[PDB]
Subunit: 243 residues, 3 copies
Amino acid sequence: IPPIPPVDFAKYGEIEEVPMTRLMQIGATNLHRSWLNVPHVTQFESADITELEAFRVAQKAVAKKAGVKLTVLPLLLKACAYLLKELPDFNSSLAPSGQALIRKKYVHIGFAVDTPDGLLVPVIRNVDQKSLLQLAAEAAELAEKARSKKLGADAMQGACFTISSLGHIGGTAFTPIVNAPEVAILGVSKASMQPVWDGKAFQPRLMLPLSLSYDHRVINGAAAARFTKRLGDLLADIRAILL
Amino acid sequence: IPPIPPVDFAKYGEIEEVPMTRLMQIGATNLHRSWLNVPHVTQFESADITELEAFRVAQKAVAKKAGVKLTVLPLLLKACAYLLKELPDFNSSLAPSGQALIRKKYVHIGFAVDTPDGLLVPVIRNVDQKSLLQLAAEAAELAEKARSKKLGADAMQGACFTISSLGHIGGTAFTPIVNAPEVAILGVSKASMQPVWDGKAFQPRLMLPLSLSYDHRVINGAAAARFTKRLGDLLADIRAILL
Amino acid sequence: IPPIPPVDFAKYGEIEEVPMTRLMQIGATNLHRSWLNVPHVTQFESADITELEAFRVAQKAVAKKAGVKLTVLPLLLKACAYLLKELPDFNSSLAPSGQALIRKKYVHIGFAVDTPDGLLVPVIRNVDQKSLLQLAAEAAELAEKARSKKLGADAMQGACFTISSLGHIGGTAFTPIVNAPEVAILGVSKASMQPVWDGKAFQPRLMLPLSLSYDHRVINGAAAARFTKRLGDLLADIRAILL
């Protein structure tokens, strides 16, 4: 690939050099490797989380009594786990012959934590088997270790899918980069109140913005519009996971 | 481009290998070729199809009497055909010297069909000369042949532009990949009822989401914001095609 | 990168060759160079410009008396200048060792002008030090020179960040390409009236669509969701720049 020409930036004014951490340089290399290998598409969708939200908030006592704080991330992790098992191509990786998929029969999901040193993506194993408060607690531990540079490489390995949530900061949607060799990543932006047509009139519903990026070699456009659709359906009534 | 490191995925749990069809491998190669050659931009827009929809629905008898089902795709195809002739740079391809455009004086448009074996993009020739019921019928034939693997390569050649519609499944918008050597592709997602400001109050209008991806070497940002704008204008009053 | 196979396009109908201007070929080369070097992400956000708009419109007399027309672009330029100084990583470039950032202590911002010959991106120097009417006037001069091919390379050099506005034509959002070696670019699409929830009911607010694309090697997802958030906050009350 042609390089970018160097510019003497100091011809235009004062400059200062600050160096990158090795975490950032590792990070920079991997993103560029994914960017060039994965033909990326993003599928946007909004889920109605009005009821999910009222549930989250009523279980505040139970969570506090268990010592965990129940955020939106365990609810996202449970639902993507159920779906990664209904739609197995999302839980797979392209074999290096490029002529096969390796479908994983396990569901371990990573989630992005932004730390001062750079980006880390701890992994929760067998998300499909843990409960909302187990996932709430584990998520919080991995993120605290991650921030304290006390996370060990063992826990950054073998994920099947990544959730990257910026809802806690803002924005309307974004286009995340697939964390190759995985095949998809969910971005979650900020929920806001919205008018949704009910057949007769517009009702305020709390809408969550989802941005699924996928490896289009492996997932076609209709499989991914169906993944965001099923996820929107599950988050609108999480009891369907019971079925 | 650096390759992705292989991972022994079975260290993390049980895996299973399923092989890709040759259609998928062809598909995978072509997308990656476009991804690396085309600097991609997507321009989003929403068109007001409230009246187009009421027309579609009133011609249900005429269509049924003609044996066709009149969906949204013939109306999209007629309008993009008219526009591919008003704005000729969208109907052209970059010559291999990279120093010229080859403007096509014909309008043949392809449309994406997702089949079990993989993605196929049959082509309708001289879309600019056929009528809504001729396009309705032909679209349906090509898609049925496509699904039955009875489509022959002759009909997958020489398109000028691609429409990729996921409206029948869901989602809010996506960023399609340009089907090189063409220079643009329209993605169409699901229509939903929306409040649109009329000067005084918000009126529910049925809005169609459009996502135009284009080859920015050949099309600049203002030409493409003008293409989605004209298309939104045409779909809001398709009689302007008569003019 | 594999090339695209040539097609005899004339097998399908009449074709015509029109040649590209050297400006377009320069343009084509640079975009492709950025596309392949920068792992791109776009962060979308909407800012409430209801009050900014009413201010713009009341200073119409002052602007007319000064000979300038006060559009939205000087207000965008002042705010991005303030922010490029609050969040310095956005005002920096990756050193060619790839192991350091060069933080620029100056703020010069470029803005995209689409001319018949192709795209030009004149630069305003020390945007942080000029006023809304100085920026209004200079912006207009550079664009007129740009359209008249009377712009000299001196004024297309050493920008820190780019604004690309298509609001004057239309659309809902787009994904601009980073103008490497800069690290981010703001796309601005068309403002429209929207229902925004106020705690109790929906109020019509004039919303401006922002699309920030960034070089993810250098900027992480949370730094960019925070940039669009602060910008949305500043445009909603531009007096915060006084603070």
